[PDB]
């Protein structure tokens, strides 16, 4: 098939009689034989450019400081919070008493109950740190 003659960085338009044409600026083709140059990803707002796009590779983003990546290729950004907090639709909210979060992301989780395994409390828990159990 003639379109296989077009390497990455070019495209084989099935219109205009399948000629290899170079990818216009701000577009790319990461593989040969493509029928169109894909639009280069743009990192705006919560997203930040990690690598600019070339004729043969898409641009890559990470998250602006204060946000963290989720999904393959950092396809999503989620807002950070501080330790002792969790993210809600209304913003960062402090952990409930008896729960904690030791990360800048994720949800709070309850303190370990030492008694349930015949253990005692060596260090009381905080909103940032779990209870420490001893024998």
């Amino acid at each position: 098939d003639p379109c296989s003659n077009c390497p990455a960085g070019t495209f084989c338009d099935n219109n205009r009689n399948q000629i290899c044409s170079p990818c216009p600026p701000n577009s790319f083709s990461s593989a040969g034989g493509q029928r169109t140059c894909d639009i280069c990803r743009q990192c705006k707002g919560v997203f930040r450019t990690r690598k600019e796009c070339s004729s043969t590779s898409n641009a890559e983003c990470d998250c602006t400081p204060g946000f963290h990546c989720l999904g393959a290729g950092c396809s999503m950004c989620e807002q950070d919070c501080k330790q002792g907090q969790e993210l809600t639709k209304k913003g960062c909210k402090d952990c409930c008493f008896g729960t904690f979060n030791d990360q800048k992301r994720g949800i709070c989780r309850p303190w370990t109950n030492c008694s349930l395994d015949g253990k005692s409390v060596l260090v009381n828990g905080t909103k940032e740190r779990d209870v420490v159990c001893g024998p």
């Epitope: 989720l70 999503m76 809600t88 989780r109 779990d130």
Partner: antibody, heavy 116, light 106 residues
Framework: EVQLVQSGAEVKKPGESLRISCKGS????????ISWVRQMPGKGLEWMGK????????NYSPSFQGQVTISADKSISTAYLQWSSLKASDTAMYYC?????????WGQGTLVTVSS | ELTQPPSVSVSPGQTASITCSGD??????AHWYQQKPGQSPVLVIY???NRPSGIPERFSGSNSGNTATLTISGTQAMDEADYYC???????????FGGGTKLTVL
């Protein structure tokens, strides 16, 4: 790349116990929740529960509380879902996923067929 | 409980609207997953309206009151799939999937 790889298909009889697994790779396994999701044939997704593998804290949805056990071995970046006694109605696809409300990675699924 | 219509059908190019209703679901973040036959679910909308990069821009979402809505403008045959809404509730730390909607395209 980040990957969640689940164990292969299982064929069991009612009354047998079973544990299936989900191995995460390419990221810090101890610091992301692992959720387990059931999908009976032709039915919808059902959240069963989740585990924080760093300290193995687990919680379950009310309809699966006491019916299954979720566990983890963080030294091998593996999460587990286990039954003490399977029923024929447990026949389903079971997915592991990373997260607690946003599931940004999914395993390929494990088919469990329970037939007398 | 999150309730979805079991079926939505459209012709190619028509707008597909998939609802997910729950009491005060507008107070939560709603996320939308797409699942094709034989495949694992894929997140197409997160935090009610945000689309992951790589998802076709014809996918959009909204959430207010007791209803969250996934909208596909100019629906294509490749969009035929099962669609599931999901929310997380901090009161009990539970995730809940809607019952699912099978989108068929003529």
């Amino acid at each position: 790349e980040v990957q969640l790889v689940q164990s292969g298909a299982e064929v069991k009889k009612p009354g047998e116990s079973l544990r299936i697994s989900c191995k995460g790779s390419g990221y810090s396994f101890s610091t992301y929740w692992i959720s387990w999701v059931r999908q009976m044939p032709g039915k919808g997704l059902e959240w069963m529960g989740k585990i924080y593998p760093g300290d193995s804290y687990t919680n379950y949805s009310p309809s699966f509380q006491g019916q299954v056990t979720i566990s983890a071995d963080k030294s091998i970046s593996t999460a587990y879902l286990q039954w003490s006694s399977l029923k024929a109605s447990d026949t389903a696809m079971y997915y592991c996923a990373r997260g607690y409300g946003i599931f940004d990675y999914w395993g390929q699924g494990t088919l469990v067929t329970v037939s007398s | 409980e999150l309730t979805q219509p079991p079926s939505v059908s459209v012709s190619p190019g028509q707008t597909a609207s998939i609802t997910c209703s729950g009491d005060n679901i507008g107070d939560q973040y709603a996320h939308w997953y797409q699942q094709k036959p034989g495949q694992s679910p894929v997140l197409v909308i997160y935090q009610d309206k945000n689309r992951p990069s790589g998802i076709p821009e014809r996918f959009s979402g909204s959430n207010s009151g007791n209803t969250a809505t996934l909208t596909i403008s100019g629906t294509q045959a490749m969009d035929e799939a099962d669609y599931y809404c999901a929310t997380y509730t901090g009161f009990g730390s539970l995730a809940v999937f809607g019952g699912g909607t099978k989108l068929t395209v003529l």
